[PDB]
Amino acid sequence: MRECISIHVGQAGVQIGNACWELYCLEHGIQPDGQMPDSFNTFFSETGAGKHVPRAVFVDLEPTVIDEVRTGTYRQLFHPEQLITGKEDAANNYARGHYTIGKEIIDLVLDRIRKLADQCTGLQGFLVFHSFGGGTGSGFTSLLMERLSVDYGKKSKLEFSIYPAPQVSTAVVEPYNSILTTHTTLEHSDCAFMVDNEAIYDICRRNLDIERPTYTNLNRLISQIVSSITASLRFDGALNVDLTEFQTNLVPYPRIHFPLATYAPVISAEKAYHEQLSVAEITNACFEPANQMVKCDPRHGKYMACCLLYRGDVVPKDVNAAIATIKTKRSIQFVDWCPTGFKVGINYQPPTVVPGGDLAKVQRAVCMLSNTTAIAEAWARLDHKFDLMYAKRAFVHWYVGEGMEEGEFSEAREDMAALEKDYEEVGV
Amino acid sequence: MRECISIHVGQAGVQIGNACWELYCLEHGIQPDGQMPDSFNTFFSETGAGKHVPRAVFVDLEPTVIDEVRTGTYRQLFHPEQLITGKEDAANNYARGHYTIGKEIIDLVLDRIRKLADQCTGLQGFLVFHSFGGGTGSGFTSLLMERLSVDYGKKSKLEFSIYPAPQVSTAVVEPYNSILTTHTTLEHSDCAFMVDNEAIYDICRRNLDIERPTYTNLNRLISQIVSSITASLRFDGALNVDLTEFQTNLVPYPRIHFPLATYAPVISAEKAYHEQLSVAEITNACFEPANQMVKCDPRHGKYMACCLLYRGDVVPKDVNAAIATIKTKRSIQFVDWCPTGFKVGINYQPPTVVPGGDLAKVQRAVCMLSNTTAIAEAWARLDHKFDLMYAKRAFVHWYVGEGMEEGEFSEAREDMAALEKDYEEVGV
Amino acid sequence: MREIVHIQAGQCGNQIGAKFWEVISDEHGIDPTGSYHGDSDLQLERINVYYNEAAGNKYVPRAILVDLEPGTMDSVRSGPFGQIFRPDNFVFGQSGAGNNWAKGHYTEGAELVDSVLDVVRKESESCDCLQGFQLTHSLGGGTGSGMGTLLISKIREEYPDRIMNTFSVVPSPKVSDTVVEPYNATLSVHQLVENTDETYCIDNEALYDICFRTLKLTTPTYGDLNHLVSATMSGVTTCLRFPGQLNADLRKLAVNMVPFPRLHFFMPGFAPLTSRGSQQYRALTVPELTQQMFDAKNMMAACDPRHGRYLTVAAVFRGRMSMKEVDEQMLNVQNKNSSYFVEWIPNNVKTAVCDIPPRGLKMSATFIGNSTAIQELFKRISEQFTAMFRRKAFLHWYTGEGMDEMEFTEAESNMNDLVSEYQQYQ
Amino acid sequence: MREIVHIQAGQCGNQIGAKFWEVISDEHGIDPTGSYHGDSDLQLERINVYYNEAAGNKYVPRAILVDLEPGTMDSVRSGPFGQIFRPDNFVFGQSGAGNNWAKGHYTEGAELVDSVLDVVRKESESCDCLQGFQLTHSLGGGTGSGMGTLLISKIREEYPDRIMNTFSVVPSPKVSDTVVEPYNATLSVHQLVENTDETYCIDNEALYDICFRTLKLTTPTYGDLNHLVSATMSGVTTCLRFPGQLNADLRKLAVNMVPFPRLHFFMPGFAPLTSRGSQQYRALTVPELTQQMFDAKNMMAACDPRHGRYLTVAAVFRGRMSMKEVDEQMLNVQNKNSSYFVEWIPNNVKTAVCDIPPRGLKMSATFIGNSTAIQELFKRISEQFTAMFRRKAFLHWYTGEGMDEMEFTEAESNMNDLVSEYQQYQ
Ligand SMILES: Nc1nc2c(ncn2[C@@H]2O[C@H](COP(=O)(O)OP(=O)(O)OP(=O)(O)O)[C@@H](O)[C@H]2O)c(=O)[nH]1
Ligand SMILES: Nc1nc2c(ncn2[C@@H]2O[C@H](COP(=O)(O)OP(=O)(O)OP(=O)(O)O)[C@@H](O)[C@H]2O)c(=O)[nH]1
Ligand SMILES: Nc1nc2c(ncn2[C@@H]2O[C@H](COP(=O)(O)OP(=O)(O)O)[C@@H](O)[C@H]2O)c(=O)[nH]1
Ligand SMILES: Nc1nc2c(ncn2[C@@H]2O[C@H](COP(=O)(O)OP(=O)(O)O)[C@@H](O)[C@H]2O)c(=O)[nH]1
Ligand SMILES: [Mg+2]
Ligand SMILES: [Mg+2]
C-alpha cells in the first residue's frame, strides 16, 4: 500500500545496504535467491511467481564493491539494472563526484529511480545511505539530492550518513568534502541521521566485549538501527510512526535537521543472562553519553526533540513511567521553548538476530533519535579543520582542476558559519 | 349513563394510568384481555359481544413507554389507535412540548378525544394525568388544556399532577417548566389534585415499612387515591359526590384551585392485626402532617375547604362525630370566612387489594382532599428557584431556540407573584 | 426508532470504534458474522439504533471508518469483528497526515472529505429519523484532529438541527506522545467549541491511573483503555435502546448539562470497577456506586474536580433498583459537598434509570460531570502553545500547507476566552 | 576496467622490470609460458590491469622494454620469464648513451623515441580505460635518465589527463657509481618536477642497509634489491587488482598525498621484513607492522625522516585485519610523534585495506611518506652539481651533443627553488 525506496551510494552506502538487505531477508523469511516458502510489500516487489526483488538502487563510480555484490551470495536477489557502476572512482574528490564523473551517470540512476517509483502506489519517500568524507558519497549524493528535490518535490528524503570522527579520520581532504556537501545539501534535505565510526568502535569494545571489531560489525549495528526505524512500516504495532512523522517532529527549523541515532540494548550473550532488560533500564541507557552512536557530549548541549521507537514485549504504561522518570532528571535538559519533546512509537515485532552475529537475542529494543545543540561542537571542530587547511590553500588545485572555483569554498565556509550561528542562537 | 374520560400524558401519566386501569379491571372483574365472565359502564365501553374497552387516551412524544403497554399484559385491553406516540421526546423542554413537537400531534389526540366523547351520553368531564417538571408532560398538557377549554367549554377538567419536591428533584430545569405550565394552565383548569414523590417515599418508609420503594408502589398508591375519588361514579353508596361537586366545593376563588390529596389508612399486614381501624381513628390520621401526600406543613397554613370520601363499612353518625371532634381541635384552624368547611361522601364498596401489593386488606378507607393556604410556601420556594436560575440567564437559549421569548418568562414570573399575593391576601 | 450515525477518524478513533462495536455486538447478541444469536427480545426491539437490517437476518453496523493511511484499516479489517463492517464504508487515503493538523484539514482532508461526506449523507438518508452523530478521534494527531474537525464542520453545515457528540482523547499533563501536540490540541479545541453540542474529554494518564490503582492491572494495554472508553460510550446511550423507569436520551442530557453553549466539555466516569481478588469483599448496592462515581480517582479526565465546582451532573443508572434510594443518595451527596456545587443552580444532578443492566453485572452506572476544573487542562494546553509560539518553533511545517499565523492567534484567543468564562462562572 | 602501462628504460630499469614482472606473475598464478595455473578466481577477476589475453588462454604483459644497447634486452630475454614478453615490444638501439644525459635525451633517444612512442600508442589504444603509466629507470645513467625523461615528456604531451608514476633510483650519498652522476640527476629532477604526478625515490645505500641489518643477508645481490623494489611496486597497486574493505587507487593516493604540485617526491617502505632465524621470535600483528613502517631503518630512501616533518602519509594494508586497530594505531602514532607532523594539516595519514595478502604472508603493509627530509638529498645533489660546474668539469662531453650552459643553469635554479619550497613548508 505504502512503499519506500532505498538508495545506497559509495562504498560505505553499498556495504551498509548489503547488511540491511540481509537483515530484511532474514526478517521476512525471504531466501537470498528471492524465493520464500504481507507487510513486506513496502520493501520488496513481486514479479512473476514467487520472486521478490528489493526496491533498491546501488550506485558507485567504481565497479569493485558492486562487483562483489554481483558475485556474492545475494547475486540473484537484486535486479541487474539497479546495480549501476562507473569505470573511474571520484578519488576522494568532491568536484569529481559533482561535475566531472557524476554528470556521466546521474541520468541513468534517475531513470532507474523513476522506473522503481512507477511501480509504487503509496511511495512514502527515499532513504539514501552515503558518507561525508568520500568523493562520490559526497558529490554524487549532493547532485542526486538536488535532482530528486527538483523532480519529486514534496516527498520526504531521509539521509543516513557516516559523520567524520573528531580524532579518527581515514582521509586527508575530508573537511573540504564535508563542508561542500553540507552546504549543497542543506536546502534539499528533510532530515539526516548521523552516526560516527569511532563511537561505534567504542560501543563494540565496551558493551559487546569485542577486541577487534571490523566494518561488518559496524554495518550490522547500522542495519539494526535502520530496521528499528522501518519496523513501523514493515509491521503492525500498538502505536505506529511512518516517515513523515520523523520529519515533522524532529525538525524545529528548516536548517536544523541533523539528529543523531542511538540504539539499546547492545550486549553480548554472556551478560544478557544476568540482566533483566526492562523498559525503564533501556530507556535510561539510551540517554547516557557512553551509549550514543556519535562521539559528542549531550551534557554540553540541550535536547530539542526526542523520538523513541520500542520493539517487542512493550506496554505503554512502562513507557510513560520511564519518560516521566527521564523528565524529572536534572542532569539532562531540554530547551525551554519545547515543553513537549518526546515522540513515542511501539511495535510488536521483537528484534531478530543474524546467525553468527555479535548481538544477543532480546525481548525489547529502543532506537532513540535526538536533535540536540551539541552537534554545534562537531560543526565548529570541522570548520576549524577547514580553516586551518584552507589558510595554506592545500589540495585546492585538485578541486579547481575538476571544475570547482574558490568562490565555492568561500560560500561553503560562510554557510557553515551561518549554520553554527543559527545553532548557537537557538540554544539560548 | 354518566361517563368520564381519562387522559394520560408523558411517562409518569402513562405509568400511573397503567396502575389505575389495572386497579379498575381488578375492581370490576374484567380480565386483562377485556372479557368478563353494570356501573362499570362509566369507565368501560361495550363493543361487539363481551369486550370492554377503556375510555382512555395515552399520549407521549416518545414511543418506548407506550410500546411497553402495547407489548405488555394489557395489550389486548386498549384500542390500538387510542395509544398515540410521537417520534422524538420533548427532552425536559417546555418549549419543545408546546410549540415545536406539540403541534405535530395534538390534532390527532383531539380527534380521538372527540371520537370518545361522541360515544358518551352523559359525559361528566376529563381526568388528565401529567407531571410538572417534564417536557411533554408540561407543554403538551398546557396546549391540550387550552384546546379542550376552547372546544368543550363548560365540562369540568380535573388534573392529577406530580409536584416537584422541595429537596428531591430529578431534572435541573424543573422550575422553568413548572412556572410556565402553571401560568399557562391557570385559566383553563377547574381544580388540580396534587401529590409529591418525596412525601410518598416517606409514607412508604414509615407506615408501610418498605425499605426500598420504587415507582410501582407510588403508582399503586396514586391509583388507590383515584379509585377512592371515583368510587362514587363507579358504585352506589349512602351519600354520593360527582365530579362537579368537587369543583363547586373545593374552589372558593377561580385562581385558588390547588387542593392536595391524602389517603388513610395505609398500613401493612403486620400492623393491621393489632389495630381497630375505626372511622374516628382514620379521620384523625387524615389530618396529621406525617400522613399527607405533599411534603408541606398544614400547621403553618389555614384550611379553606375539606372533602372526605369514606368507603366500606361506614355509617353517617360516626362520620359526624369524628368531624365534630376535628372541629373542636385547636391545632388545626379554618379560615374565618368559611364557617362550613367539610364535604362528606360515603360509599359501600370497600377498597380492593391488588395481589402482591403492599397495602393490607381493610374494611374502611378515607380519601381527604384539602384546599389550604400552606401551598403558598411551596409556590414561594419554586419562585425563588426560578429567580435564582433566571438571574444568570442559564438554560434560556434552549427554550428560546424552540420558539419561546423571554417576555414569556417575565409574564410567568409576574403571574406567579400575583398568585402568591392572592394566597397571602386570602390567608388574612 | 431513533438512529445514531458513528464515525471513526484516525488510528485511535479506529481502535476505540472497533472496541466499541465489539462491546455493542456483545450487548445485542450478534456474532462477528452479522447474525442474531441472543435470547432476550429486548436486544432486538431497538436494534435499529446502531445496526441496519440487510436481508437474510444479517445486521451491518451504521458506522463510517475514515483514515488517511491504509494501515489501521487493514488492521481493523483483519481483526475480530472486522467482517461486520460494510466494505463500502472504508474510506482511506494513501498519503497520511503525519501528525500535521494542516495536512488533515487543508491538504489531504480537503481531498477525502467529499467522499466521506457522500458516505455519511447516504447513511443519514437511509434512516427514517436520526438523533445525531457521534465521533471518536484524538486531538494530538494530524489525521484524527484536523479530519474530525473538518467532518464536524461539514456535517453541522449539512445537519444543523441534530446532535453532535464527540469522544476525543486530549493531551496528557505529564507525558506527551507528540512534540507538536499543543498546536493540534489548540486548533481542535477552537473548532470544537463552535461546532459541537457536547464533548467528552478522555485522558490516557487517567485511564492508566484507573487501571493501576482500581483495576489492579499489572500490565495495562491500549485494549483495556479502549474497553473502558467503550463501556462509557455504551452507558451514555442506554436509554435509546432499552426500556427503563426514567428515560433520558441525548437531547435530554444536552438540555440538562450545558447551561451556556460554549460550556459543553464533560469528564466521564464509570462504576463499578473492581479487581479480581477484591470482588468478594463488597456488596453491590447504590451507595457504593455513588461513592465510586463521585471520586477523583475514578475520573477519566486528568483533572481533579475538587479544585473547582460542579455546574451540572448526570447519573445514568442501569439495572433493577429503587428510585427512592437513588434520589435520597443524590440529595445526600449534594448536601454533604455543597461547597463543590455551584450555588445559583439548585439540583445540579440529573437522574435516569434503565432496567437492563450490562451483561455480567447486576448493576452499573455512568457518571457525566460538567466541572470548572477543565480550565486547568485548557490553561496548560494554552500555556504550552504560547511557549511554543513565542519562538515560532515547528511553525513552518504548518505554514507551508497554507496556514496563516492569524489562525494560530485566533485559536489562542478562543482558548483564553473559554478559560476566562470558566473562571468567571466559578 | 582500469589499465596500467609499464615501461622499462636502461639497465637498472630493465632489471627491476624483470623482477617486478616475475613477482606479478607469481601473484596471479601465471607460469613463464603465459598460461594460467592458479586456484583462486580472484587472481583472474582483475588480471586485465597488467596482462593482455592473446587467445588460447595465454597472457602477455602490457610492458614496453627500451634500451640503447642490445645487451640487457638479450639478458632479460634469455633469463627466467623472458618468454612471456611480446617480441614486438623490445625496442633497442645499437650505439648506447655512454652514461651521458645529452646522448640519451638529444642524439640517440631522439631517434628511438618515435618507435617507442608508436609502441606505447598502440598499447594505450588497445586498452579501453587506462589509469596511467608507470616507468622504471635510474637517474645516474645516460640511457635511463635522458630516455625516461624524453618519454615522460612525450607521453604527458599525448596523455595529459592520466597518472604518471616513476620508480627511479636516485644517487646515494656515500658512494657514487658514476663520475658524472650529479649532472644527470639534476637535469632529470628538473624534468621530473614538471612532467610527473608522483615520484618514488629509491636509494641503493638504503637497500644495502636494510638487507644487512634487517634481513641479516651476508651477501646481498642486485636481485634482492630488485625484489624489495618489486614488492613495493606490487604493494602500491593492490587495490586495483583485488577486493578490499577500503579501496585506494593511484588517483586517490595522488589526491591524498601531494598538496602542492611540485611536492610529489615520496620515500617508500615495506613491512614485515625479518630474517630466517628471527621469524619465530615475533607475532604478526598490526602494531608490529606499523612499528616497522614508522622507522628510519626501514625506509628505502637514504634520508632520516626525523630531520624534518611529514606532510602526508599513506599506509596500504593487505590481509584480513580489523579496521579498529588500524585506525587506533595510526591515531596513536600521530599523537606520540606530533612534533614530526605538519601542524596545518590535521590527520596526515591516509589508510587503505585490501583483503588478499601476498603469497606466503598472512599480513603485510606498504608505507608511502611525503616528508621534507628529501630536501637533504636534493641539497646534496645541487651542491655537488655547483661544485662541478664551477670548474666546468666534464662539460664538453655534454656540450658536444648540442646542449647549452643555460640548461644547466635552469636545472640548478629549479633544484634551488624546490629545496627552498621544501624548507619553507618545513
Ligand atoms: N561504517 C562504515 N563506514 C565506512 C565503510 N566503508 C567506508 N566507510 C567510511 O567512508 C569514508 C570514506 O568514504 P568512502 O565510502 O570510503 O569513499 P566513497 O564514498 O565511495 O567515495 P570515493 O572516494 O569516490 O570512492 C571513510 O572515512 C569510512 O569511515 C563501511 O563499510 N562501514
Ligand atoms: N410518581 C411518579 N412520578 C414519576 C414517574 N415517572 C416520572 N415521574 C416524575 O416525572 C418527572 C419528570 O417528568 P417525566 O414524566 O419523567 O417526563 P415527561 O413528562 O414524559 O416529559 P419528557 O421529558 O418530554 O419526556 C420526574 O421528576 C418524576 O418525579 C412515575 O412512574 N411515578
Ligand atoms: N486510548 C487510546 N489512545 C490512543 C490509541 N492510539 C493512539 N492514541 C493516542 O493518540 C495520540 C496519537 O494520535 P494519532 O491518532 O496516532 O494521530 P492520527 O493518526 O493523526 O490520528 C497519542 O497521544 C495516543 O495517546 C489507542 O488505541 N487508545
Ligand atoms: N637497484 C638496482 N640498481 C641498479 C641496477 N643496475 C644499475 N643500478 C644503478 O644504476 C646506476 C647506473 O645507471 P645505468 O642504469 O646503468 O645507466 P644507463 O645505462 O644509462 O641506464 C648505478 O648507480 C646503479 O646503482 C640494478 O639491477 N638494481
Ligand atoms: Mg569508492
Ligand atoms: Mg419522556
Residue numbers in the entry:
A (entry chain C), B (entry chain A): 1 to 37, 47 to 437
C (entry chain B), D (entry chain D): 1 to 426
Sentences from the paper on this structure:
Additionally, we observed a slight (0.9 Å) compaction of spacing between adjacent tubulin dimers along a protofilament with respect to a taxol-microtubule lattice in the absence of HURP, raising the possibility that this protein could indirectly alter the recruitment of KIF18A and other factors by modifying the structural properties of the lattice. We also uncovered a complex HURP-microtubule binding behavior, likely involving both structured and unstructured elements in HURP and tubulin. These interactions may influence binding cooperativity, as indicated by differences we observed in cooperative binding of HURP constructs to microtubules, and by how HURP compacts the lattice geometry.
The dynamics of kinetochore-attached microtubules are regulated by hepatoma-upregulated protein (HURP) and the mitotic kinesin-8 Kif18A, but the underlying mechanism remains elusive. Hepatoma-upregulated protein (HURP) is a spindle assembly factor that localizes to the chromatin-proximal region of K-fibers in a process mediated by Ran-GTP signaling. Through its stabilizing and bundling activities, HURP regulates K-fiber dynamics and spindle morphology, contributing to chromosomal movements and alignment. K-fibers also recruit Kif18A, a member of the kinesin-8 family that walks towards and accumulates at the plus-ends of K-microtubules.
